[PDB]
Design a protein around this nucleic acid. Structure first.
Lengths: 97, 95, 82, 106, 95, 109, 80, 98
DNA sequence: GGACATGCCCGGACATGCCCTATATCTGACACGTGCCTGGAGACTAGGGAGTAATCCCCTTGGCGGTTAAAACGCGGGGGACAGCGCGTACGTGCGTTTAAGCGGTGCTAGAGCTGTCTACGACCAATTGAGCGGCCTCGGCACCGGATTCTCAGGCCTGGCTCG
DNA sequence: CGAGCCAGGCCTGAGAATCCGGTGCCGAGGCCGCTCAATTGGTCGTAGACAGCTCTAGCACCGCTTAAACGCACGTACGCGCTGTCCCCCGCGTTTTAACCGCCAAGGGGATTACTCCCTAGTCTCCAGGCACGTGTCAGATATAGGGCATGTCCGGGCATGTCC
């Protein structure tokens, strides 16, 4: 049957998700993760709805920015595929690693 | 009946002054309130430090003006200083 | 006690995050590092948030606690209080 | 009759409210009369500029109500506002539709 | 005879003689120590003030100081500092 | 009248409780100030000074040097992970940099 | 004027050497000059603003310390 | 034939020499002339304290050393050794200065 | 050498889904009316911090020189920057499934939020003196220069085995 | 078998770390005098700890639906490795030049001290507009439908080199 060339659909998804604004990370697994981490610092924590939404907005913005920088370093290296070493370089140069 | 602090009516008046045809959503209004509060905190804090460094215990317009010049970019600083000076002169004359 | 919910941070979700960041191609090996990175982020934020919660003689984390924690880490967030 | 300083000055932000927030923040032991007027005027200027750009962006989108997306476009498209808010994340703002030239097809 | 300029030189020297009886200190190094101590002071006092403000607290106490120390210092440093502070404050209160 | 004895001595500390208290009071931080805040501050500053001086002394003796110089202070801060983290955005005058060569720059056989 | 050439080629080489680089392209020098000049512009701007607010005519070391502090890099050893 | 080291040996020797010591590497007076010229574009007839120029110079050398460290790391990431302008531009773009 | 006919390549002619444009519904979220009461506005008092004048000396600016380490330039070269090609392998893309994400409704009680009292805690002022800061001496740890020394390294002489006549 | 020329190994010729040593030097540590602010003492405002009540939504549960994750199959585009090229920067040598220390004049303004003055905290009293609450109402989310075109694909015209007379 019909099959799209590698690359057209990736670009289509990039345009689609950069045009709109809905959250892309699932709410419930994020909340569950938050509860697991909270459990190891202080017992039986309760979290506001707007608090979990705040953590999710912050996390998604941080990851989007990190992936932007990773893509820029990869293309700088005449690459398109992102590698773990790309993530590590981006985080080291940003000064958090 | 818990009184809060917001600039909603004043932001709406300025908006009607500049564009008396456009509304504003709750999220956008929250972003505007966060923005105005942030700018306020930044400018007031810089003015306070400026005053402390020069052994001044009173907040007057010269330190405010210098802080504005430090924080705002070129054209923004020039227009803000011009508007502030005209407004303060009109108020002082009007008493 | 919730256990092994780390597998809930799915591969396609990370792919969508990368799409929003302008990434065209993503290695399969990226995801675990990203998961680790995400975990690290949480570990800092929650420590500050719960600390504020604990200082105020509260045991429920509030939106204001989170916004202050994010601000004091330089990643100030708008939309949940000033 | 009582007439406020903002009314005498022709400004929209309240001189009294800005005065109370400056006084009660534990910033200084005395406060001048012109400082909150000046501050209100600068805040007005910046609000007018941001709403101007956001309205423009909304009209370009054939929208009559400004949304957070339009605010993000306004802040990120303006070089000086973007500089002022370089370390600011606006919720529900998204990002600019910016695609690197090398990633485009040949 | 110039104006009174405050510094911590003698206290740093006393602590040094407590910890290293036979070690000296240069003027440049003392300046680095003064910058360090003043910086930590500014950070802790500012964070404590902000903490107290956030909770509608008008009085500076020891709990906010302790929490600020725990926020700014790493793990074992925070634990050791807290232990020293509590022992010292309770011993002082005994007098 | 009772004999005057200092608060630092009462606390077993070397940093001046009175002086730190005056600088805290006059730093425009709050209208009201507790008695235990300057005690905590003096204790933390003395502890941090003691740790930095330990590391700097170690470095000085490793160099057979008897006086602490800025170079030794820079080495001491950077050689401890937690001090380096705390002072990540601090430049020490006359401190230099760590001796460190990337593996790829070394010659090969 | 012509003072930009006073940051001489061997000087940029030495600064780069302390940074741990082994080889330095010929086009590096102009880039370094531009970056340094912009940095100086921002620092000196802040310093002169502080000097003028204090009604002074000479830039002091403390003015520079404040400029550097507000720029995001605190420098120890010249007061404060 | 006169003695000649292979390319690199002297580079490593100078790396060790300048990383071991701390004396300033940029000339004082040319920097001073540059600073006054640049400053004069903002305010005329401005004066400078000696310790002010020394502070500015220490800051400048620390900044350049750090930028060159990051540039070298980015170059090595690209399996390269020689630094080029695009490396400087990448380092400054990722640091957020551009 | 001239004519012929086609192989092949690149620039115009094409059936599916993605983008774009039009429109009905509603609905809940945005815009507007109200009470009041607590903060904003008008007014008097005080005092202390800010505005202004005279000094000085010290801290900066200005100038000559020498001479030497640093700067500018010439030039060999080799190793690293850069272009080109193979590959295979891990990643883009399509499809069924289940797995859980997301929405609607209710529990209710732990926990966030508002108010009452007052007593410990801290602001505020007089006298004091002892710790804390400015000025001076000095000598010892540090800075500058000469001296012998070894070491990982290079080069020349001697030995040994391969090859040709 | 005798002569030849070199590969290779081992025992003397070498630019930086090993200190090793000496001498000067200048500034930090100690001492002393002055001085100003922390103490001690007391009094009085005040505010937040603790109780107590209220009331909001967080957590858990249940239910359902449906978009998304995951595993697999398959094609494929480039990261890495390899090879070749070249160019242009490192290292050394030569000439230059101003950096830096030395020394000395001069002026101007930062800071100090004193005098004055006026501006806002504080308090009092009255009033007005901003915020829960409530309510009307309308622009975008949701949904469906229709036009038009990008795209992997096909076809015709032009170019090029092979072959025959």
């Amino acid at each position: 049957p019909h099959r799209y060339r590698p690359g057209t659909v990736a670009l289509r998804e990039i345009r689609r998700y950069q045009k709109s604004t809905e959250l892309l990370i699932r709410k419930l697994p994020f909340q569950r993760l938050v509860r697991e981490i909270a459990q190891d610092f202080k017992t039986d924590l309760r979290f506001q709805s707007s608090a979990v939404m705040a953590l999710q907005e912050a996390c998604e913005a941080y990851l989007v920015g990190l992936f932007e920088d990773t893509n820029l370093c990869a293309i700088h290296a005449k690459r398109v595929t992102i590698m773990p070493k790309d993530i590590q370089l981006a985080r080291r140069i940003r000064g958090e690693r | 009946r818990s009184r809060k602090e917001s600039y909603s009516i004043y932001v709406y008046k300025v908006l009607k002054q500049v564009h008396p045809d456009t509304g504003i959503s709750s999220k956008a209004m929250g972003i505007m309130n966060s923005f105005v509060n942030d700018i306020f905190e930044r400018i007031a804090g810089e003015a306070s430090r400026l005053a402390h460094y020069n052994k001044r215990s009173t907040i007057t317009s010269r330190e405010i003006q210098t802080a504005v010049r430090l924080l705002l970019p070129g054209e923004l600083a020039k227009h803000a200083v011009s508007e502030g000076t005209k407004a303060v002169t009109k108020y002082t004359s009007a008493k | 006690v919730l256990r092994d919910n780390i597998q809930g941070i799915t591969k396609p979700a990370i792919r969508r995050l990368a799409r929003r960041g302008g990434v065209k191609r993503i290695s399969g090996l990226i995801y675990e590092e990203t998961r680790g990175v995400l975990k690290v982020f949480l570990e800092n934020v929650i420590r500050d948030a719960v600390t504020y919660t604990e200082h105020a003689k509260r045991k429920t984390v509030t939106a204001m606690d989170v916004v202050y924690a994010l601000k004091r880490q330089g990643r100030t967030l708008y939309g949940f209080g000033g | 009759k009582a007439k406020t300083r903002s009314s005498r000055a022709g400004l929209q932000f309240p001189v009294g409210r800005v005065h109370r927030l400056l006084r009660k923040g534990n910033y200084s032991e005395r406060v001048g009369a012109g400082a909150p007027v000046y501050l209100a005027a600068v805040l007005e200027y910046l609000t007018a500029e941001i709403l101007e750009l956001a309205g423009n962006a909304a009209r370009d989108n054939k929208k009559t109500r400004i949304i957070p997306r339009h605010l993000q476009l306004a802040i990120r498209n303006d070089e000086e506002l973007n500089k002022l808010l370089g370390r600011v994340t606006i919720a529900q703002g998204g990002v600019l539709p910016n695609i690197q030239a090398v990633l485009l097809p040949k």
